[PDB]
Structure 1
Amino acid sequence: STGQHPARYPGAAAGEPTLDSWQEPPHNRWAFAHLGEMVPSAAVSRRPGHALARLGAIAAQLPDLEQRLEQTYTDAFLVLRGTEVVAEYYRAGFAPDDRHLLMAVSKSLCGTVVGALVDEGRIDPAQPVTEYVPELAGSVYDGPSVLQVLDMQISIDYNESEVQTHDRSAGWRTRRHGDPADTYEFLTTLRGDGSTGEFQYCSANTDVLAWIVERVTGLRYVEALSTYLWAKLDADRDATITVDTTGFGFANGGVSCTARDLARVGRMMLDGGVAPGGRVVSEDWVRRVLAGGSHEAMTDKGFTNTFPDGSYTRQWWCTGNERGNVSGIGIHGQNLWLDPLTDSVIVKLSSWPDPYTEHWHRLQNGILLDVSRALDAV
């Protein structure tokens, strides 16, 4: 058993509705107003073919930028300097207001929600995960602290296979006989040697954070993400997040939103944690994110080869470079890149053919760093 979870709707029984019961009362009143949460659905456009390139002033400094963006399968690119959009690019077929999957950039959003709850005193990072999710007793999450989950410093046997099993349990792939029923169940099956302290990137960690969020607030993660973050950004559009059969949002990588709206998250980070709709996280939380995690814990050569003094903390990758760059990162080329020096945010949403290779990583970081430097006063 995985304990109490936020009901899909007020008064809903556990796990209700399912694909086979949503047309039945009392589920249908809710389902008829949220069918996309139960059945794959397409948008029928209210609006009746070429790339949109508005690189602005950085074009003179980076003449081959558009070509570089094309080479890295860029779908949406936006540079926010201060409160102003100074550069934009959208591939042919992708509108400026279209939403794009964030993959692991979603993790940085989840960490932000956790941070908001820490500020309220509803979550103490020093406490063990089991203080909030007792049902994780007996799993690899039995012993580690919430902060160790936030910093991903837990050794886990996660063949990266656990990765595909995670997808199947969440609805991202077709289920196989015997698979865990939902994401909560999947998490309870995870094991490790018990060691902690060393960084190990594992998407299961973020879903555990979302589970903690649900237990401390009583809200579905989808709602918590809106209440604690999205609804305070004065966003142009709602964001979306895939949900599993219980309605649990895929916190580790299922959020989709527009490039301009994702930039509002970065703006909030560079504004000390304050957004137009109110404070999202404390100044202290933002400071800790920008400061970075323990360098000694970071042993991922894939990251340190490029960023020797890099680290990871609270669901954000910290380059530790001369500019103090920090970034949310997702496979296939997603970045919510922060450049505090120039008070700028760079959003790059892409679709590389591969989830990750040293090649794409090199090209992508080259673009983000060049764009950042192009914003420097001269």
Structure 2
Amino acid sequence: STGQHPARYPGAAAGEPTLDSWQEPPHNRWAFAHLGEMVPSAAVSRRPGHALVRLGAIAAQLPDLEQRLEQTYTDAFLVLRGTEVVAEYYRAGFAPDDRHLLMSVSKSLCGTVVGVLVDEGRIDPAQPVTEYVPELAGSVYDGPSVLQVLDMQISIDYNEDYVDPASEVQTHGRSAGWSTRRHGDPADTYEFLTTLRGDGSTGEFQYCSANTDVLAWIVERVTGLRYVEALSTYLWAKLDADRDATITVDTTGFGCAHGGVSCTARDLARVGRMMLDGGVAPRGRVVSEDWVRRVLAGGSHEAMTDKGFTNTFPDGSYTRQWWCTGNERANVSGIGIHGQNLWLDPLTDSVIVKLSSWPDPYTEHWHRLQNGILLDVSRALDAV
């Protein structure tokens, strides 16, 4: 058993509704107003083939930027300097206010929600995960602290080979509803997480999407809110965003905290703006100055042994669901596969959003090109 979870609606039975019950009372009063949570659905546009190119000032310093964006499969690109949008690009077929999947940039949003609850003293990072989710006893998450989840310093047997249906990465996806279920699969994400094992060692960075969903589970047990609602209440609703974000949900309504958020490029930039404003958003403080300082300061360098990162960023690290480059600009970024970045450049008080669709989830090639663009743009923002 995975214990108590936030009901899909007030008074709902555990796990209700499902795809097979949403039409039935009492579920249907909720489901009729939220059908996209149950059944795949398309937008029917209220608005009635060409790229939008407004690269502003940096265009002069980076004449080939549009081509570089095309080459890295850029869908949306936006530079916010202070409070001003100073550069924008959207590919043909993608509107400025279209939403785009964030993949693991989602993780940085989840960590921010955890941060709010740490500020409130509702989560103590020093405490074991099991202080908040007892049902993870007997799993790889029995023993490690919440901070070790935040910093992803837990050794976990999690096969990342996505061509093998038996792999943890594929099983995680099926448990989240991202792919067709197979016989024997865990019923939902909570159950999947309880199946995870490891040798018990901690302290070394291991990037693992299970960690972020554990954080979201903790958020739910501490607040009693569905992660979907927590993400809105503690973050999204404070941004004064143009549009709602969306997040995929599994069969219990659990949002895919680790990878399933979509939003507009301009709205994602508001998250970066909040980070560079010491944790304050237009509608109130999101996280404390201290939390933001700790993110910008970076994680343990000793822990960071991923050469896919350190080959480019020798002094890099990871903390609280953010990648910290440790470069001479101290850049910090949310990163997601196929080319998603929420890139922070505190030196110039700027945020760069790049949302893309590389054909491959990861290669050294793509990251070299992408990081080259983000660094060139950052430097183009320097006073001269």
Name the TM-score, length of structure 2 as normaliser.
0.98
Deviation string 1:261-314 (CA, Å, 9 cap, x unpaired) is 000000000000000010000000000000000000000000000000000000
Task: Measure the CA separation in 2 of the matches of 1:352 and 1:204.
Answer: 23
Deviation at 1:178, TM superposition (A): 0.5
Task: Measure the CA separation in 2 of the matches of 1:277 and 1:12.
Answer: 31
Q: How many aligned positions are there?
A: 378
Deviation at 1:176, TM superposition (A): 0.2
Task: Measure the CA separation in 2 of the matches of 1:229 and 1:164.
Answer: 29
Deviation at 1:120, TM superposition (A): 0.5
Secondary structure in structure 2 of the residue aligned to 1:227: helix
Deviation at 1:114, TM superposition (A): 0.1
Deviation at 1:106, TM superposition (A): 0.1
From 233, 239, 245, the counterpart of 2:239: 233
Secondary structure in structure 1 of the residue aligned to 2:87: strand
Task: Measure the CA separation in 2 of the matches of 1:34 and 1:9.
Answer: 11
Secondary structure in structure 2 of the residue aligned to 1:364: helix
Deviation at 1:66, TM superposition (A): 0.1
Task: Measure the CA separation in 2 of the matches of 1:337 and 1:364.
Answer: 11
Deviation at 1:96, TM superposition (A): 0.1
Task: Measure the CA separation in 2 of the matches of 1:251 and 1:243.
Answer: 9
Query: What are the residue-to-residue correspondences of 1:240-259 with 2, within 5 Å?
Result: 240-259=246-265
Deviation at 1:222, TM superposition (A): 0.1
Deviation at 1:74, TM superposition (A): 0.0
Deviation string 1:326-362 (CA, Å, 9 cap, x unpaired) is 0000000000000000000000000000000000000
Structure 1 runs not aligned, ≥5 long: none
Secondary structure in structure 1 of the residue aligned to 2:205: coil
Task: Measure the CA separation in 1 of the matches of 2:117 and 2:264.
Answer: 25
Secondary structure in structure 2 of the residue aligned to 1:231: helix
Deviation at 1:181, TM superposition (A): 0.2
Secondary structure in structure 2 of the residue aligned to 1:287: helix
Task: Measure the CA separation in 2 of the matches of 1:16 and 1:169.
Answer: 16
Task: Look up the match of 1:190.
Answer: 196
Secondary structure in structure 2 of the residue aligned to 1:329: strand
From 353, 358, 370, the counterpart of 2:359: 353
Secondary structure in structure 1 of the residue aligned to 2:347: helix
Deviation string 1:103-138 (CA, Å, 9 cap, x unpaired) is 000000000000000000000000000000000000
Task: Measure the CA separation in 2 of the matches of 1:153 and 1:309.
Answer: 17
Name the TM-score, length of structure 1 as normaliser.
1.00
Deviation string 1:194-218 (CA, Å, 9 cap, x unpaired) is 0000000000000000000000000
Runs of 4 or more off by more than 3 Å in structure 1?
A: none
Deviation at 1:31, TM superposition (A): 0.1
RMSD of equivalent CA atoms:
0.2
Secondary structure in structure 1 of the residue aligned to 2:318: strand
Task: Measure the CA separation in 2 of the matches of 1:43 and 1:60.
Answer: 38
**Residue 203, structure 1, aligned to residue 190, structure 2:** no
Deviation at 1:30, TM superposition (A): 0.1
Deviation string 1:244-269 (CA, Å, 9 cap, x unpaired) is 00000000000000000000000000
Secondary structure in structure 1 of the residue aligned to 2:53: strand
Deviation at 1:325, TM superposition (A): 0.1
Deviation at 1:319, TM superposition (A): 0.0
Deviation string 1:216-246 (CA, Å, 9 cap, x unpaired) is 0000000000000000000000000000000
Deviation string 1:128-155 (CA, Å, 9 cap, x unpaired) is 0000000000000000000000000000
Secondary structure in structure 2 of the residue aligned to 1:335: strand
Secondary structure in structure 1 of the residue aligned to 2:20: coil
Deviation at 1:22, TM superposition (A): 0.3
Structure 2 runs not aligned, ≥5 long: 161-166
Deviation at 1:99, TM superposition (A): 0.1
Give percent identity, aligned residues only.
98
Task: Measure the CA separation in 1 of the matches of 2:91 and 2:362.
Answer: 21
Deviation at 1:77, TM superposition (A): 0.1
